[PDB]
Design a protein around this ligand. Structure first.
Ligand SMILES: O=C(O)c1cc2cc(Cl)sc2[nH]1
Length: 126
């Protein structure tokens, strides 16, 4: 069902949370080789998550599930805020700008924390 597809999407999201925290530890420790690898892993995970989310939103639309569509339109918008911040973070890493990397990292954490009550609301709406 769309509900089990959302649980699968939620797990991919939690995987990115896990890798992100390991990445934050590596950044603080100065292990740039590790950070580079974790950033590649996160890019792939976010690409996957975004794709599942779109398939969930399109399915909710075809199902006429107006409330789920409303919530998923909001949630995908916020996902794109996180994605833009992540991409800027990756650029800061390429550029050697640890000040910008720190800023983007904290922002990406707060955008993720904010978007969690909605993530739970979608599970219940589908
Ligand atoms: O690159 C992406 O698509 C992407 C990165 C992040 C971080 C988030 Cl929280 S949501 C999100 N999406």
């Amino acid at each position: 069902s769309v509900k089990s597809e959302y649980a699968e999407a939620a797990a991919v999201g939690q995987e990115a949370v896990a890798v992100f925290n390991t990445m934050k530890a590596a950044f603080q420790n100065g292990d740039k080789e590790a950070v580079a690898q974790y950033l590649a892993r996160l890019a792939s995970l976010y690409t996957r998550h975004e794709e599942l989310l779109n398939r969930i939103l399109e399915k909710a639309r075809r199902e006429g599930n107006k409330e789920a569509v409303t919530l998923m339109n909001e949630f995908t918008a916020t996902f794109q805020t996180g994605k833009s911040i992540f991409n800027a973070m990756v650029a800061a890493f390429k550029n050697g700008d640890d000040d910008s990397f720190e800023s983007y990292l904290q922002a990406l954490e707060k955008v993720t924390a904010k978007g969690e009550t909605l993530a739970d609301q979608i599970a219940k709406a589908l």
